Amino acid sequence: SAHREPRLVGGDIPCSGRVEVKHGDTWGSICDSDFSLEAASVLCRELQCGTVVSILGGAHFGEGNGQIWAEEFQCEGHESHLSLCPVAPRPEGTCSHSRDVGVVCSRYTEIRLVNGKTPCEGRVELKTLGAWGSLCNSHWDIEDAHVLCQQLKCGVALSTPGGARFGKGNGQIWRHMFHCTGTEQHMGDCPVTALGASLCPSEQVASVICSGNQSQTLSSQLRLVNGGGRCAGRVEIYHEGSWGTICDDSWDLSDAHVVCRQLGCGEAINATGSAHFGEGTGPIWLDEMKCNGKESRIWQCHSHGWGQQNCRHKEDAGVICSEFMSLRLTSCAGRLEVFYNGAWGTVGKSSMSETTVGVVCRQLGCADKGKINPASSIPMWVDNVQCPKGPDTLWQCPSSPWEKRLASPSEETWITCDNKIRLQEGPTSCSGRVEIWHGGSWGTVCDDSWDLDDAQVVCQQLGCGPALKAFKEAEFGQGTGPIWLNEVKCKGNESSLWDCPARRWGHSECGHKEDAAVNCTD
């Protein structure tokens, strides 16, 4: 089990850091060319860190002091430990410490229990932005308490005592709204939403009293599907052990209100129909929902009965709730716009750190970093957004509460995301190995079917001049992270490498020794 024991060091959040693997007894770094997405997934799984968010090569969390291992992990991605992974050691030189690999996993939450008589109950205390703080009890349900107790290994939660029972706590209140269903064993797996979360009374601090028996386990259904979020999508209901849809007959805002308040998504904005979020694959359970908009559950409405319908899947009902938040850039480059409460709105530029811009760019899936620009008219929704390290979406980023207020264009935020594609380890900026950003991490392109047309499309994507050479076999050096593309069958005139046909987004049989490079004109 300690054959290749991984660990994360150099990170300021629990499940991110420079990857160090212990070969028996010596802790040593890993070059980013020897650590694929599958190996990072195995590393995050073994450390109980959840799913891999990003592979950060080039010593993102600082260079390690010691020795660099020369083994390329050929993990299949389903392994439980890094010891079970097959590796391909190389006798020759390995790498430089300026290219150590770092991995960001998804369990960054760092929530604990403080000021309790028995070690595992008390005031819930959360750490974001480098400072501990009390969580608000407005959205601290018993399911969140159950997940927290399971994470701290004390079984289930007895109660969430409201008020300052365990103490108000010396610090500020964190407004994060954990949306745990109770079925997950870590608060980092829960969908948390801290953007614009409403202010909290000082004395309304969340707490929890766990059962304390580890052997004690939780014992026992509506969901929204294909909505591009959490509070929108096709209304899917569960009955007779099957996920079924609701026909959009007489499906109005009252029905949407009921399903949105049942899911904890606030009121509703749209009661969509005609399969707005895609046709479902399952029996239609309800046909004519006659909810008054006041009851707390959808099944307790005046429907036609389970399975009693005259509808098809082409008209499955779906909803868009008030708590449905969306993000976009309009002119990636343009004005940052957040879609909350059914209305698009700009984001305040105040306290917009580099981390927040990077989070926005990663969320939009077009860069790892970005920069704020002056304006090149809609009101401002949120302001003072402060993204910590670890969230790949803006909605987990604490900020001032939502306020529908008018904003001058000067103090809104315009950001230009960095290039999707970069050239690394080259003498100039127009030559080197092709790197592309997708899926949270920088990756490479393999040299299979890497002719000069692919070099042409890469050069015209970076803005460089015409392509000169399309190198193969990692001429400029082995790359970082996963191999996103191989067999790119470009015609040489595409607007970007993404439109070019290829075996896309991982699963390429190529290694990092076959990294594709280009030589553009200065």
Ligand X SMILES: *[C@@H]1O[C@H](CO)[C@@H](O)[C@H](O)[C@H]1NC(C)=O
Q: Does 228 bind ligand X (CB under 6 A)?
A: no
Q: Which of 270, 326, 419, 496 binds ligand X (CB under 6 A)?
A: 270
Q: Does 269 bind ligand X (CB under 6 A)?
A: yes
Q: Does 448 bind Ca ion (CB under 5 A)?
A: yes
Smallest distance, a second copy to C-beta of residue 511, A = 6
Query: Which single residue is written with the structure tokens 């990003």?
Result: 54
Say if strands 483-485 and 431-438 run parallel, antiparallel, or are unpaired. Answer: unpaired
Can you count the helices (H) and strands (E) in the chain?
Answer: 5, 33
CA distance 289 to 292: 9
Query: Which single residue is written with the structure tokens 């968010």?
Result: 53
Choosing among a second copy, ligand X, Ca ion, none, which partner's interface includes residue 23 (Cβ < 5 to 8 Å by kind)? none
Q: Give the phi and the psi of residue 430 in degrees, each rounded to 5.
A: -105, 10
Choosing among a second copy, ligand X, Ca ion, none, which partner's interface includes residue 519 (Cβ < 5 to 8 Å by kind)? ligand X
Q: Does 462 bind ligand X (CB under 6 A)?
A: no
Specify whether the CB–CB gap between 120 and 154 falls below 8 A: yes
The string over 136-149, giving b where at least 16 C-beta atoms fall within 10 Å of a residue's C-beta and e elsewhere, is bbebbbebbbbbbb
End-to-end alpha carbon distance in the chain: 51
Q: Does 76 bind a second copy (CB under 8 A)?
A: no
Which of these ranges, 206-214, 288-296, 336-344, 355-363, lies near Ca ion under the rule CB under 5 A?
Answer: 288-296
Q: Does 89 bind ligand X (CB under 6 A)?
A: no
Q: Which H or E run contains 442?
A: strand 441-445
Give the footprint of ligand X on residues 484-513 (CB under 6 A): none
Choosing among ligand X, Ca ion, a second copy, none, which partner's interface includes residue 312 (Cβ < 5 to 8 Å by kind)? a second copy
Burial of 198 (C-beta count, 10 Å sphere; 0-12/13-18/19+): exposed
Q: Give the phi and the psi of residue 399 in degrees, each rounded to 5.
A: -160, 175
Site string for a second copy, 332-351 (x = CB under 8 A): --------------------
Site string for Ca ion, 166-185 (x = CB under 5 A): ------------x-------
Q: Does 142 bind ligand X (CB under 6 A)?
A: no
Q: Which of 272, 355, 413, 456 binds ligand X (CB under 6 A)?
A: 272
Q: Does 456 bind a second copy (CB under 8 A)?
A: no
DSSP structure string for 365-402: TS-S-EEEE------EEE------SS-SSGGGS--SPP
Q: Which of 469, 489, 491, 507 binds ligand X (CB under 6 A)?
A: 469
Which of these ranges, 105-113, 155-163, 257-265, 268-276, lies near ligand X under the rule CB under 6 A?
Answer: 268-276
Which of these ranges, 146-154, 265-273, 375-383, 398-406, lies near ligand X under the rule CB under 6 A?
Answer: 265-273
CA distance 500 to 457: 8
Choosing among Ca ion, a second copy, ligand X, none, which partner's interface includes residue 427 (Cβ < 5 to 8 Å by kind)? ligand X
Identity of the residue, 119 or 427, whose beta carbon is nearer to ligand X in the bound complex: 427
Specify whether the CB–CB gap between 107 and 43 falls below 8 A: no
CA distance 42 to 50: 10
- List the structure tokens of 2: 């300690």
Identity of the residue, 248 or 323, whose beta carbon is nearer to a second copy in the bound complex: 248
Smallest distance, a second copy to C-beta of residue 274, A = 8
How many of the other CB atoms lie within 10 Å of CB of 493?
A: 11
Beta bridge partners of 21: 6, 28
Nearest by Cα to 126 from 113, 142, 145, 115? 113
Choosing among a second copy, ligand X, Ca ion, none, which partner's interface includes residue 487 (Cβ < 5 to 8 Å by kind)? none
Q: Does 250 bind ligand X (CB under 6 A)?
A: no
- List the structure tokens of 433: 């190995």
Say if strands 370-373 and 242-245 run parallel, antiparallel, or are unpaired. Answer: unpaired
Smallest distance, ligand X to C-beta of residue 471, A = 7
SS3 66: coil
How many residues form the binding site for a second copy (CB under 8 A)?
27
Site string for ligand X, 296-325 (x = CB under 6 A): ------------------------x-----
Binding site for a second copy (CB under 8 A): 72, 74, 88-91, 249, 304, 308-312, 314, 448, 450-452, 469-473, 509-511, 513
Binding site for ligand X (CB under 6 A): 269-270, 272, 320, 426-427, 431, 468-469, 519
